From a paper:
Mcl-1 (myeloid cell leukaemia 1) is a member of the Bcl-2 (B-cell lymphoma 2) family of pro-survival proteins that regulate programmed cell death via apoptosis. Mcl-1 is an anti-apoptotic member of the Bcl-2 family which binds to pro-apoptotic proteins containing the BH3 domain, a short α-helical stretch of around 16 residues. Here, we report the characterization of an antibody fragment produced in vitro against Mcl-1 which was formatted as an scFv and a Fab.
C-terminally tagged constructs incorporating a TEV cleavage site leave five residues of the TEV recognition sequence post-cleavage, whereas N-terminally tagged and cleaved constructs leave only GS at the N-terminus. Interestingly, the C-terminal tag remnant formed extensive crystal contacts in both the C2 and P21 CHO-scFv crystal forms, as well as being crucial to crystallizing the scFv complex. In the crystallization of the individual antibody fragments, the positioning of the tag on the C-terminus resulted in a tag remnant after cleavage, while no remnant is left behind when the tag is on the N-terminus. As shown by both crystal forms of the CHO-scFv this contributed to the crystal packing, and its removal with carboxypeptidase Y led to a less favourable crystal form and no crystals at all in complex with Mcl-1.
Numbering used by the authors: 1 to 118, 136 to 254
The structure:
Amino acid sequence: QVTLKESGGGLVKPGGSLRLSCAASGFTFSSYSMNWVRQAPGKGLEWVSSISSSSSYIYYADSVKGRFTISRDNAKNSLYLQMNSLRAEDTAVYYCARQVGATWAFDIWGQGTLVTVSQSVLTQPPSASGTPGQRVTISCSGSSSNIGSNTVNWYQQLPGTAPKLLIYSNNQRPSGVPDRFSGSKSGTSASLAISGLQSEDEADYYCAAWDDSLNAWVFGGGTKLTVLGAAAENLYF
């Protein structure tokens, strides 16, 4: 029973401050690097910050650097995100995520907390569609400093759920993912293939890679996959 639970979200005026909290249980919190990832309503995933197991190594997304502060309390098994100089653009659902050291994959995600304050580096097709049984391949195009230098991870986000790790280290499936899902990487581009498409595969798919030039995680804009049947077309010859 591995759980992450975020708290602290709500309505805040621009220029304001909030502190988000992420409570962890069921694992050795003090031995993992942790991250904040956000999702603006109806938009893609956007990494915010990371902190190593003893707080020695901290990174920020360029847009939040100098305004946000990440911290952790290993005694209270808690992760925090202090947000200052809040902007309309900070309106999002904020997720807490655990990072696996050997791969950098985000294998456990929280449930998310909404913050309302009142373009992606990796390139994905915004939509994909297929009929059940077919094979669909989704591309993710990056550059030399990200996909060209580092492994690619893929996350599946089912409607009304938090994202889940789908593929790590380019082509590895975690425990829980069937062989119908396969990943590949060549040069500065990566692909996710879904064989034997099923109605339950209707979800958003995201590719992610560390970028050595930005010193940041870069996520794709997301591919909404639709599984559509029959189609009563009027063919006229």
